[PDB]
Amino acid sequence: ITTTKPIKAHFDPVADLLTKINNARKAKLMTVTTIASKLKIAILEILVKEGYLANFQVLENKSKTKRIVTFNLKYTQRRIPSINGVKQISKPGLRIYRPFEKLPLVLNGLGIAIISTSDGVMTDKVARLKKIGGEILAYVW
Amino acid sequence: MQYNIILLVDGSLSLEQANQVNEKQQQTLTNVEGLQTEYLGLKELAYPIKKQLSAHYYRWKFSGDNQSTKDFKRTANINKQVLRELIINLEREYGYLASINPKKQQLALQKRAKYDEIIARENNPENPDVPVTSGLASTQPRLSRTEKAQKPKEELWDVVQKMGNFD
Amino acid sequence: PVVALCNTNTNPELVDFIIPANNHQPQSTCLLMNLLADAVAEAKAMPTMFAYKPDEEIQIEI
Amino acid sequence: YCRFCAIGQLRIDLIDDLEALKRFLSPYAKINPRRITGNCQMHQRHVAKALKRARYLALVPFVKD
Amino acid sequence: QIDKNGIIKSAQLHDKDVGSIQVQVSLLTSQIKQLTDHLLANKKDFISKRGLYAKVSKRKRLLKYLKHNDLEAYRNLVKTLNL
Amino acid sequence: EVKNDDLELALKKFKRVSLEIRRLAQRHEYHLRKGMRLREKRKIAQKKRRKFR
RNA sequence: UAUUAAUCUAGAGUGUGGUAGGGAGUUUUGGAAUUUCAUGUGGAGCGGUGAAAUGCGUAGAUAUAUGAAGGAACACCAGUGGCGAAGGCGAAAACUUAGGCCAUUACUGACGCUUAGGCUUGAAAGUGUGGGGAGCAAAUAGGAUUAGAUACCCUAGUAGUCCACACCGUAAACGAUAGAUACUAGCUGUCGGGGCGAUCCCCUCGGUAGUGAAGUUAACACAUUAAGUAUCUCGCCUGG
């Protein structure tokens, strides 16, 4: 697996991932590559586990200290994209945190909310039962 | 460094006094060695300088330090028996990069297209072909290897169609 | 519904069926138009010059 | 096409290239622009500098009127 | 000239490493010393002033990095003159 | 300047060179700002290019 | 996230090879030309403008050819051009020097972006100090014009435009567009570096152009050289 053209770290993984996925959803591509991290791979797994991401392969370079991840887009019949919007609530400058009882809902709570809380990365519905608060990063729908 | 000095001798005096003046003003350099002395004959002036019409150009090539040029320059400028004392240094537009050697073929190849001794020649003075060698890679590849894949899926190719029922 | 002969510069959404092929050349358009004419004439059991005819014929532009 | 780029000069000294330098002068000693010869930009600027020095070195007339 | 041969051969940990902070600060100090004389010779040159300010700011940045990262690394630097 | 021909054929080239010299010399009849002179240079270049192709 | 201990180079830096550039300070020389003067040639106009007049012209104007002195600017070169942070940079050379580009198994090792305050530079005009002052001309005079003209027209014309020291920091100092950044359809040019190699044409990346899809937008229009989905920071605004 060779690309002949490397990819760089932009300013922060969180912003870059959402910008790239939105660019993929708007520019009609099939394969898009990003930087990889444990938080990154966790977010990708929790997105793909419920039909929002697609087949993703993470590659590790020959020096075992570098790794990136390529991921396909969630498409459906008759050429229609599935990602209908991403909004990053969190920011490198502003780190807004909310308690458990005020966990935000995705327009009815029917979308997907990412809660990277002290008990790892968990979605809204599963974390509601735990009665455990956490942080909110991005609404995806 | 490298240096070239082009000098205009005074008037149209004979070659013997010309060489005498050349060496006399050449001994004005502070400590430069490895020099060379050449001559370029007699040429007329397309425009009068002070009152004369002909002169000799003399080209001296040498190399040395950057702090051994003031004396000769000022001595030539003060003396009234010289006309032009132009100086050229390697800062002039140049190229001698060590990878320019394969230009030898070029120096002949164009002459191949300009060669002509008969009037029935039908060769190509301009034919852009650039004979292909298939060696064009000058970028660094970055090889990589995968680790795992979670929930693989195969994507159907693009199809744009509707109207499944008409009859 | 609409079918069309689209060159490699069109938008594959305006026409319900895209058949990309040459249009600047005459005999290619002739061939495709004859195939489509056979496709529209097969309803009335009319014969065909193509469509399971292993041999082709040439008609250059004049 | 111009006989300054394909063959390749890449170095213009004061002399040993007089014919090429005079090839870039009009009867009135004006330096013809790119729109006639067709040589490259860098080559044109190089010969322009060389011709200016030659004017200063009295190889070609400043003006012929 | 800006010739760079002398201070490099004595301010490096080894001949295999030329990117250490030691050679960086030594070369930057040598260049600053050159530009001081260059600018005092050419009083009314402003691009030289800008270059000198940029290089001294770079030296200050390297010094503060070594201050807050490796105290022993610049404390033993006797070739580099403080103030 | 100078121009030479036997008796008659001079006239066409004489007209060309005379008009070119007049158009060149009209630039040193009344002074304008240097920036405006550069803008005029740009405009003349655009006019010539669009008329030359 | 933050403190901190310890590793790696994918960020950025310095090293190596190649490479472009009116970048910049100081210092020498040249060319047309303009003015003045000298020389011989000649006799009533020259100049200006719509027409005229002031003015210039027996003291030989104007012009012509040569020669001497003088100060400023560098014809084409010169461009869908280059270089810079900007201001801006264009006759030739010299020394000093700033930054950038391409390719790299070089090396420290997150040293980076941004920046309230502080510091530096910054067209032109203006002043103080000493020169220079060929034209060119703020104010002012005169002639002409005008209902009236302190203006557009013309003849003088001193500041200043030039230099050396210092201050002033202002302009539509514009891309009416802050900087750093990843990604996001294409096409026609155009300059440099590398490979290829007669350039011409091909490929990789850059800065400089135009066109143009999605999208953006009140519209004009924008579009890989964003005014796009976006992040970080500084500054700024809440009716005249």
PDB file of C-alpha atoms in Angstrom, chain C residues 7-41:
ATOM      1  CA  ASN C   7     -20.878  12.869 -25.022  1.00  0.00           C
ATOM      2  CA  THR C   8     -18.255  12.994 -22.265  1.00  0.00           C
ATOM      3  CA  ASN C   9     -19.273  16.491 -21.178  1.00  0.00           C
ATOM      4  CA  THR C  10     -22.889  16.163 -19.965  1.00  0.00           C
ATOM      5  CA  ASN C  11     -24.648  15.889 -16.612  1.00  0.00           C
ATOM      6  CA  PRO C  12     -25.821  12.298 -15.982  1.00  0.00           C
ATOM      7  CA  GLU C  13     -28.999  13.402 -14.195  1.00  0.00           C
ATOM      8  CA  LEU C  14     -31.065  15.366 -16.742  1.00  0.00           C
ATOM      9  CA  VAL C  15     -31.672  12.333 -18.991  1.00  0.00           C
ATOM     10  CA  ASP C  16     -33.029   9.125 -17.449  1.00  0.00           C
ATOM     11  CA  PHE C  17     -30.763   6.929 -19.609  1.00  0.00           C
ATOM     12  CA  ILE C  18     -27.176   7.798 -20.528  1.00  0.00           C
ATOM     13  CA  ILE C  19     -25.489   6.036 -23.455  1.00  0.00           C
ATOM     14  CA  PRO C  20     -22.014   7.609 -23.766  1.00  0.00           C
ATOM     15  CA  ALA C  21     -20.535   7.304 -27.250  1.00  0.00           C
ATOM     16  CA  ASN C  22     -19.025   9.369 -30.041  1.00  0.00           C
ATOM     17  CA  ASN C  23     -21.206  12.042 -31.635  1.00  0.00           C
ATOM     18  CA  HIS C  24     -18.704  14.128 -33.642  1.00  0.00           C
ATOM     19  CA  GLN C  25     -18.266  11.170 -36.018  1.00  0.00           C
ATOM     20  CA  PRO C  26     -21.127  10.409 -38.444  1.00  0.00           C
ATOM     21  CA  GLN C  27     -21.248   6.620 -38.767  1.00  0.00           C
ATOM     22  CA  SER C  28     -21.217   6.040 -35.000  1.00  0.00           C
ATOM     23  CA  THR C  29     -24.334   8.190 -34.652  1.00  0.00           C
ATOM     24  CA  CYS C  30     -25.804   6.398 -37.672  1.00  0.00           C
ATOM     25  CA  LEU C  31     -25.229   3.002 -36.025  1.00  0.00           C
ATOM     26  CA  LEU C  32     -26.629   3.997 -32.636  1.00  0.00           C
ATOM     27  CA  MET C  33     -29.660   5.698 -34.201  1.00  0.00           C
ATOM     28  CA  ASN C  34     -30.363   2.600 -36.292  1.00  0.00           C
ATOM     29  CA  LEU C  35     -30.126   0.388 -33.196  1.00  0.00           C
ATOM     30  CA  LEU C  36     -32.576   2.669 -31.396  1.00  0.00           C
ATOM     31  CA  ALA C  37     -34.889   2.688 -34.434  1.00  0.00           C
ATOM     32  CA  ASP C  38     -34.910  -1.108 -34.370  1.00  0.00           C
ATOM     33  CA  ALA C  39     -35.590  -0.894 -30.622  1.00  0.00           C
ATOM     34  CA  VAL C  40     -38.653   1.308 -31.254  1.00  0.00           C
ATOM     35  CA  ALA C  41     -39.807  -0.671 -34.306  1.00  0.00           C
TER      36      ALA C  41
END
